[PDB]
Design a protein around this ligand. Structure first.
Ligand SMILES: Cc1cc2nc3c(=O)[nH]c(=O)nc-3n(C[C@H](O)[C@H](O)[C@H](O)COP(=O)(O)OP(=O)(O)OC[C@H]3O[C@@H](n4cnc5c(N)ncnc54)[C@H](O)[C@@H]3O)c2cc1C
Ligand code: FES
Ligand SMILES: [Br-]
Ligand code: NA
Length: 333
């Protein structure tokens, strides 16, 4: 193994192991949001040593950047003892990344092309609401990310919301065709940075959360966590789907709203109109409801283009860049 360090903290990395996984398995945090080379948030400066850049794509890590000594922690494997620089906060404690002993407790068809998967764990998992877990497709080897809908106290049964992708390896080929209660599932977690700041740094200000499709999943955990901390706070949760057939858990959100007068749940249908529901695209509905985003925080999760367009729309209505949070469901193939 090689010694790899960030922020004064050392871990030992096996030669076939990536920098990111070595650090998180040691409880040493650095930014990460996909573990597959697409989000670019794990970019590092190599200060000393040497890495193999692995499968790092050019659009995430250019030849120019490699020549200047940058790398992606989730793609880089050490070829010598290596010292790296991440962000200022890298090196702080985080929940350790670990291998899970996970068993399917339930798989339920909950909406058009949508399944809930409940995974029971042998041991409690420490995580922040909004983090995700990485599943391995049995027999295939493909790795795919699924956000937790859980609050952190729901630490023994992981809740996933899975959207069927036609022709998809993990969804069409397994989670929608074959997965059954009692199956063991290869999984590691937690991963990801899409979560609330520590309670001490949470001013209780208003939040808008926008989920495209099953991008709703981490927002369920984040919204419930935020409301537990500040029960009267304003939390606007928009669910952007094609039609009413895509909606789910309406009763659960209604119970949240009855308890929390600042909470609202707003379906937004883009393709199949329904008189009961707002039409259009979900970021558009928030802008209509809240014409000025100044002083708001915003949480966007879903397909990458939806997130990126939503971020820009938030900023044009003067929401502060510092308070905009993103989780992109970027395809792995
Ligand atoms: C951090 C992160 C968190 C995620 N959390 C969730 C979650 O909570 N719930 C969830 O359902 N998914 C989530 N995803 C997306 C998920 O990991 C898979 O990519 C998705 O389920 C499709 O995988 P697949 O193997 O079925 O399709 P693949 O076999 O990888 O793709 C099949 C084909 O369809 C294309 N494709 C892939 N995705 C889409 C898509 N949405 N729409 C249209 N075409 C597509 C692919 O490019 C490919 O050509 C997350 C992704 C990331 C990076
Ligand atoms: S590019 Fe490395 S975690 Fe996303
Ligand atoms: Br476990
Ligand atoms: Na990193």
């Amino acid at each position: 193994t090689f010694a790899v360090s960030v922020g004064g903290r050392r871990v030992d990395c096996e030669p076939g192991q990536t920098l990111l996984e070595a650090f998180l398995r040691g409880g040493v945090w650095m930014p990460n949001s996909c573990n597959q080379g697409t989000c670019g948030t794990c970019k590092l400066q190599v200060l000393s040593g040497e890495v193999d850049h692995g499968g790092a794509p050019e659009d995430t890590l250019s030849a120019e950047e490699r020549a200047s000594g940058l790398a992606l922690a989730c793609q880089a494997r050490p070829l010598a003892d290596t010292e790296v620089r991440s962000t200022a906060d890298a090196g702080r404690v985080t929940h350790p990344l670990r291998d899970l002993t996970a068993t399917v407790l339930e798989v339920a068809d909950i909406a058009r092309d949508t399944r809930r998967v409940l995974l029971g764990l042998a041991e409690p998992l420490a995580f922040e609401a909004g983090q995700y877990v990485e599943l391995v497709v049995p027999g295939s080897g493909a790795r795919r990310q699924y956000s937790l809908a859980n609050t952190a106290d729901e630490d023994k049964v992981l809740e996933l919301h899975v959207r069927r992708v036609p022709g998809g390896v993990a969804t069409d080929g397994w989670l929608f065709d074959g997965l059954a209660a009692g199956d063991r599932v290869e999984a590691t977690g937690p991963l990801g940075d899409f979560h609330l700041p520590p309670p001490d740094e949470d001013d209780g200000g208003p939040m808008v959360l926008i989920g495209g499709g099953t991008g709703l999943a981490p927002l369920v955990g984040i919204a419930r966590t935020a409301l537990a901390r500040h029960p009267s706070r304003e939390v606007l949760l928009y669910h952007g789907v094609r039609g009413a057939a895509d909606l789910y858990d309406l009763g659960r959100f209604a119970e949240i709203a009855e308890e929390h007068p600042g909470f609202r749940f707003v379906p937004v249908l883009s393709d199949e109109p329904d008189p009961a529901y707002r039409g259009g695209f979900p970021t558009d509905a928030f802008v209509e409801d809240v014409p000025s985003g100044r002083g708001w925080s915003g949480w966007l999760c879903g397909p990458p283009a939806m997130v990126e367009a939503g971020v820009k729309a938030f900023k044009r209505r003067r929401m502060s860049p510092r308070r905009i949070h993103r989780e992109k469901f970027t395809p792995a193939s």
